[PDB]
Ligand binder design. Structure first.
Ligand SMILES: Nc1ncnc2c1ncn2[C@@H]1O[C@@H]2CO[P@](=O)(S)O[C@@H]3[C@H](O)[C@@H](CO[P@](=O)(S)O[C@H]2[C@H]1O)O[C@H]3n1cnc2c(N)ncnc21
Length: 1338
């Protein structure tokens, strides 16, 4: 059969009769025969119960019975009587049909709602039947034909039935995951998530809307299998973790291999069909059927490749997710089991980090593993195809691609070093900014704001130098990326043309190799990432192996007996296998309900005893028989971040009477009162911090509530005061407390409660010297006596304006020029490939190469240009935005700083500014590039085929809807996952810190179950994110495949009016457009969530600012305060009025103080002098000039203040005294000498340039106060204000020494100093209670 006359070269293409009856029937039957055996593996290993008896299942089974009969009815007619094929073809078909009906039967038995096999098999059978059908209907325009019609109709109905999903098996999961219930088609197309996609677009997702996890992804089903496998390997054996990993999750992972192979083959199938189409358009006088025949082949191959690839994505990521979950669980269990000796050597941060990155590396590696063979083979295969196409010249074409792999790497590593440089400078600035943010009070008072702004600008210049260098380096980074396509094309084509003149450049020889270069880009660029990830995963394997192999505790140490209470005979314990025994000879019997105080010389082994009783020490010998539950009060109190109530409860049923008897018996009532929410307050490191004594009380309260029979109290009363300790012992530990019948064993170094103890076990270097009772031990006069004797589109326009209109417009124009250069390069290639051959060589071949080179060189330069433009633009915008934000912040009044959430300014200056200067330019570059790559593909499709504008509207609508839904619903899922990630590591830190208490109470099961919930919660948000990426993927590749199909169809329909090169270029760009579309959506999502930073940086633009610092119309004279005559004329300060009815007059050079209680307007009065808060009603005038009219800086410079706590800023002492450096060195020296500081200031090796740290931590409080006094003295102003809280004698004498000439206001909380100052003003509630000298006061 297979004669090309009727199958290939004919107007009516009909498969031959033999071919119809043999191969078209062997294909489907054969598919089920090879899959059937393999399918039992899945059907057996994976079970979900059995589906009930439904009409659908039966309908399918009955049609399977009838179909088999019909096919065997053919054998009956063939038997009735010639051709051998008229017997076997139907018989085999009947047998495979009997396998099909048996398969739906067993699939019902094994719980299968929809079958992919029973769907692909029917699809293949349908296509084969369709081919025979068309042939049989063309043969007759009766005997065995009618049997085939019946067969085809039954097969079609069977295929339609196989699409519907059956009922769920009878054998809660509120809001579950539709993955386990969706039909084969929905799983293939990932439609089941579109629900959340639409819902997320309308109702912003929360933690409870997220679907539950399928049973296999729950940590409760993936940790026990890994634990069992690791136990089996450990018991069998240097145990290897990799063998465990690929034995536990490898079988599910191996299905990725098939998908990867099919995807590679289907990816390569594209260029071959492209070559066939280019041949077809060049081959005139050829049937249209061959051209349309292929346009279908391209479409089907592209769609199938898209579907298979994402299954692989899903499969790998599922395996990686499972890997992460199982590693997390095993690490948690190991950490709860391992020995203290093996645990101390490894750092706590080492272990939390082992779960923070090492565990996740493997989860990520899942997407860089298969490439280990996909990337080489692809490349190799591609190279071979390229070698088949052009020749050895293509080696030169790729010689530059392999040259870009190291170069690009060298680029990234360098900018990493700049990343290190920039970051460093940024740290310094934020540090400086932090000092301004917490010290804005002092700056405004001295008007030193501009001086600090200058230092901020200097640090910013330092940061922008590195930013400029990184900017220039980035420009070549994009240049090479965009130039690569042209570079490889020009290099290979110029070499091909120049090497030999007989080499003809045809459309197939130029565009097929051009597309092969595109499918070579990826496998050649991911290899370094794959290798780096594999090496990091290998070091993670080593780290996890050495951790999971750690030594462990053995329950044999203590023989706990369910409730002579504590029994130890000849027991020696160690803290390590090789270290000497901490306790050599331990032998004691503690009876039930007895109080035993282990007492001894610090460094004896008291805490070791309790640790041993808890099986924390390593028992080298002996016998310990602790009887009943043990409640441990550790020396170092472990506090859970949960509320104080749940700290005391410790996962136990709340009993109001017992809880309320425990809380005050520990004297926790005052602590409950001071704490904000009472016992519901969030204690711990993260929440409210607690004093050591409060932590010990909480630990003791938790132990007392747990109601154990044996208590091990390792110094519970170390941090509680003597009265609190005695009260606690009276109501808790004493014989008349809460634990009267409980076997208490306490470690103490305090004698006060010793006589009340039943037995006192004194030790010595880990050896009991005497074991008796207080009175008996005292009578014996031995070791115990010795012890006792011991003692929004507008934000984009705002960002463009920040860059500047000129730079943005120039960048857009140059980037359009790049676009046109690339397009005309492609058009020139198309025109070049169409030249005829005369005398065995192209008519023109040198001028075409020259124009190609010129076009490409123009492309490269403008790419390097516009990239540099946005780099300069980005840096310009960063400078302008920082300057504007700094001006707005510093110009704002204090009320803004007080009222704003203190902390949202810091991340604005650090995180959002970092977002602006670095991420925004890169994102705008790549988004703009992707957008115009898509537009170029569209225009080169529409230009080459004018009548293709009917497909743009629907596909654009599909793209717009998909992009809208994805961006909206994915930037929220990412936030949910990010939020959910942290609690796992926080809980691990808590467990690591409290493991001894966790094991002592034997509540490790509860905390194991808790770590289940948090990891499951994180997975519940991570899984929808990857499925969201898959949903994007399938929708966008469907759009791209439709583009390819329509481009090829509209090129084939107009073969006469088109040339080979034009069709080739159209198809190559249409093939490329899918990746550009995907990255365009991904980049648009990146830009939407990135540009908002500018919006939050444009804040405080209109925020009410202070009065102008310099008016310059009503500026005062140089000697503004000639005498300093202050007059508060009906002053009222809004804050309802803290200051009210203030009519006072302080004469020039008259000492005046302000006295008043808390809540008066004493301090607010100073804020009136410096205009910190605008006067609600008042006319303060100094001498003959109003303050409100004067600019702020002027008055703030002519009046000085010595505040409550002097703020010393980082830098030299001279910059502290004179930030402007306006005063000469002699003045600074004189002021420092007059401030009783000459002796100290001369002592520093740096002279005046002593580098004081943040807040002057190196300097003492007295020194900082004297430095502030030195600042005030150096100012030399007639009006000075003092704010009083050892060195008081010195500062008081100094303010009384030379400032007698100047007018001094004084607000002191101490009456002793104010008595010296005449004219005291007393403020009761803002009113002037008394106005006169202290002599008139008394
Ligand atoms: N199935 C597949 N087959 C072939 N290649 C595939 C592929 N899937 C993915 N890609 C990749 O998609 C990108 C296609 O490029 P674009 O679509 S033209 O744009 C990129 C992209 O937007 C993003 C990163 O994309 P990226 O992952 S780095 O890698 C390439 C390409 O390798 O940033 C842009 N971009 C990349 N490099 C630069 C640069 N130096 N300067 C500015 N913008 C850059």
């Amino acid at each position: 059969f297979w004669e090309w006359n009727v199958t290939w070269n004919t107007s009516n293409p009909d498969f031959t009769k033999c071919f119809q009856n043999t191969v078209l029937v062997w294909v489907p039957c054969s598919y089920l025969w090879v899959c059937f055996p393999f399918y039992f593996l899945y059907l057996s290993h994976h079970d979900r119960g059995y589906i009930q008896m439904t009409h659908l299942n039966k309908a399918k089974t009955a049609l399977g019975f009838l179909l088999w009969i019909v096919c065997w009815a053919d054998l009956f007619y063939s038997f009735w009587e010639l051709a051998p094929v008229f017997l076997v073809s139907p018989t085999l078909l009947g047998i495979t049909m009997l396998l099909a009906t048996f398969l739906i039967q067993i699939e019902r038995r094994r719980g299968v709602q929809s079958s992919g096999i029973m769907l692909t098999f029917w699809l293949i059978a349908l296509l084969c039947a369709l081919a025979i059908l068309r042939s049989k209907i063309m043969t007759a325009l009766v005997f065995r034909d009618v049997t085939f019609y019946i067969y085809f109709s039954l097969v079609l109905i069977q295929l339609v039935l196989s699409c519907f999903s059956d009922r769920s098996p009878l054998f809660n999961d509120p809001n579950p995951c539709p993955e386990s219930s969706a039909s084969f088609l929905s799983r293939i197309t990932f439609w089941w998530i579109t629900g959340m996609m639409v819902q997320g677009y309308r109702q912003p997702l929360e933690s409870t809307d997220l679907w539950s996890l399928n049973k296999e992804d729950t940590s409760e089903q993936v940790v026990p299998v890994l634990v069992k496998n690791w136990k089996k390997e450990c018991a069998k054996s240097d145990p290897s973790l990799f063998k465990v990993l690929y034995k536990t999750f490898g079988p599910y992972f191996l299905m990725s291999f098939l998908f990867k192979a099919v995807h590679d083959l289907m990816m390569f199938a594209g260029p071959e069909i492209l070559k066939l189409l280019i041949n077809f358009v060049n081959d005139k006088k050829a049937p249209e059927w061959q051209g349309y025949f292929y346009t279908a082949l391209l479409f089907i191959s592209a769609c199938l490749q898209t579907l298979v690839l994402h299954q692989y994505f899903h499969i790998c990521f599922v395996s990686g997710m499972r890997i992460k979950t199982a590693v997390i669980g095993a690490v948690y269990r190991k950490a709860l089991v391992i020995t203290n000796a093996a645990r101390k050597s490894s750092t706590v941060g080492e272990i939390v980090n082992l779960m923070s990155v090492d565990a996740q590396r493997f989860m990520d590696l899942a997407t860089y593993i298969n490439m280990i063979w996909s990337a080489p083979l692809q490349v190799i295969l591609a190279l071979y195809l390229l070698w088949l196409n052009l020749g050895p010249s293509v080696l030169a074409g790729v010689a530059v691609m392999v040259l870009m792999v190291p170069l690009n790497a060298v680029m990234a590593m360098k900018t990493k070093t700049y990343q290190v440089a920039h970051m460093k400078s940024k740290d310094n600035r934020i540090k400086l900014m932090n000092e301004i943010l917490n010290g804005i009070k002092v700056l405004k008072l001295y008007a030193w704001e501009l001086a600090f702004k200058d230092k901020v600008l200097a640090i910013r210049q330092e940061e922008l130098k590195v930013l400029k260098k990184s900017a220039y380096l980035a420009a070549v980074g994009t240049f090479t990326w965009v130039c690569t396509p042209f570079l490889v094309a020009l290099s290979t084509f110029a070499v091909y043309v120049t090497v030999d003149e007989n080499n003809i450049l045809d459309a197939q020889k130029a565009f097929v190799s051009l597309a092969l270069f595109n499918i070579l880009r990826f496998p050649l660029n991911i290899l370094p990432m794959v290798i780096s990830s594999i090496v990091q995963a290998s070091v993670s394997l080593k780290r996890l192996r050495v951790f999971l192999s750690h030594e462990d505790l053995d329950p044999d140490s203590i023989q706990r007996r369910p409730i002579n209470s504590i029994t130890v005979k000849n027991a020696t314990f160690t803290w390590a296998r090789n270290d000497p025994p901490t306790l050599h000879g331990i032998t004691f019997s503690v009876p039930e309900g007895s109080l035993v105080a282990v007492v001894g010389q610090v460094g004896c082994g008291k805490s070791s005893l309790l640790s041993a009783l808890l099986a924390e020490m390593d028992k080298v010998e002996g016998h310990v028989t602790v009887k009943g539950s043990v409640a441990y009060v550790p020396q170092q109190a472990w506090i859970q971040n949960i509320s104080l109530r749940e700290n005391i409860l410790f996962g136990r049923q709340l009993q109001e009477r017992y809880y309320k008897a425990v809380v005050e018996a520990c004297a926790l009532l005052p602590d409950l009162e001071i704490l904000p929410s009472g016992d519901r307050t969030e204690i711990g490191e993260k929440g409210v911090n607690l004093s050591g004594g409060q932590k010990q009380r909480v630990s003791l309260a938790r132990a007392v509530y747990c109601d154990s029979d044996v208590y091990l109290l390792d110094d519970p009363l170390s941090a509680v005061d003597a009265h609190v300790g005695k009260h606690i012992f009276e109501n808790v530990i004493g014989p008349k407390g809460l634990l009267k019948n409980k076997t208490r064993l306490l470690v103490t170094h305090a004698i006060s409660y010793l006589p009340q103890m039943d037995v006192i076990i004194v030790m010595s270097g880990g050896k009991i010297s005497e074991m008796g009772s207080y009175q008996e031990l005292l009578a014996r006069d031995g070791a115990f006596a010795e012890f006792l004797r011991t003692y929004k589109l507008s934000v984009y326009w705002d960002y463009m304006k920040a860059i500047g209109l000129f730079i943005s417009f120039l960048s857009i124009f140059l980037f359009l020029c790049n676009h046109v250069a690339s397009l005309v390069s492609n058009y020139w290639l198309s025109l070049w490939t169409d030249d005829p051959i005369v005398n065995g060589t192209q008519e023109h071949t040198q001028v075409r190469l020259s124009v190609y080179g010129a076009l490409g060189i123009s492309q490269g330069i403008t790419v390097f240009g516009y990239s540099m433009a946005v780099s300069i633009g980005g840096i310009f915008a960063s400078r302008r935005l920082h300057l504007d934000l700094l001006h707005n912040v510093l110009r704002s009044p204090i009320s803004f700083f007080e009222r704003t959430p203190s902390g949202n300014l810091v991340n604005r200056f650090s995180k959002e500014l970092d977002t602006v200067d670095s991420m925004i330019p890169q994102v705008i570059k790549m988004f703009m590039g992707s957008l115009f790559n898509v537009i170029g593909a569209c225009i080169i499709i529409l230009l080459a085929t004018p009548m293709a504008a009917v497909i743009i509207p629907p596909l654009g609508l599909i793209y717009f809807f998909v992009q809208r839904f994805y961006v909206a619903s994915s930037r929220q899922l990412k936030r949910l996952e990010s939020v959910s990630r942290s609690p796992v590591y926080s809980h691990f830190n808590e467990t690591l810190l409290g493991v001894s208490v966790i094991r002592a109470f034997e509540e490790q099961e509860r905390f194991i179950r808790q770590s289940d919930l948090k990891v499951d919660e994180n997975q519940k948000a991570y899984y929808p994110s990857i499925v969201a990426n898959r949903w994007l993927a399938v929708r966008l590749e469907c759009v791209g495949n439709c583009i390819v199909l329509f481009a090829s169809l509209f090129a084939v329909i107009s073969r006469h009016s088109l040339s080979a090169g034009l069709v080739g270029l159209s198809v190559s760009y249409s093939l490329q457009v899918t990746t550009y579309l995907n990255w365009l959506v991904r980049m648009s999502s990146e830009m939407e969530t990135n540009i908002v930073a500018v919006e939050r940086l444009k804040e405080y633009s209109e925020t009410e600012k202070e009065a102008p610092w310099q008016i310059q119309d009503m500026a005062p004279p140089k000697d503004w305060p000639q005498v300093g005559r202050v007059e508060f004329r009906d002053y009222g300060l809004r804050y309802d009025l803290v200051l009210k009815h203030i009519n006072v007059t302080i004469d020039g050079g008259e000492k005046v103080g302000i006295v008043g209680r808390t809540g008066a307007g004493k301090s607010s009065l100073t804020l009136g002098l410096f205009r910190i808060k605008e006067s609600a009603e008042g006319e303060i005038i100094i001498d003959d000039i109003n303050i409100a009219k004067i600019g702020l800086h002027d008055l703030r410079f002519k009046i000085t203040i010595i505040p409550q706590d002097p703020v010393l800023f980082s830098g030299s002492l001279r910059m502290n005294l004179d930030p402007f450096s306006q005063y000469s060195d002699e003045e600074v020296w004189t002021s420092l000498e007059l401030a009783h500081l000459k002796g100290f200031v001369s002592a520093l090796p740096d002279k005046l340039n002593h580098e004081c740290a943040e807040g002057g931590e190196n300097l003492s409080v007295g020194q900082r106060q004297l430095v502030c006094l030195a600042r005030a003295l150096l100012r030399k102003t007639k009006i000075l204000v003092l704010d009083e809280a050892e060195t008081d004698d010195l500062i008081q004498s100094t303010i009384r020494t030379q400032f007698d000439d100047c007018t001094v206001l004084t607000i002191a909380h101490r009456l002793n100093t104010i008595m010296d100052y005449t004219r005291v003003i007393v403020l009761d509630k803002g009113e002037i209670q008394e106005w006169g000298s202290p002599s008139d006061l008394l």
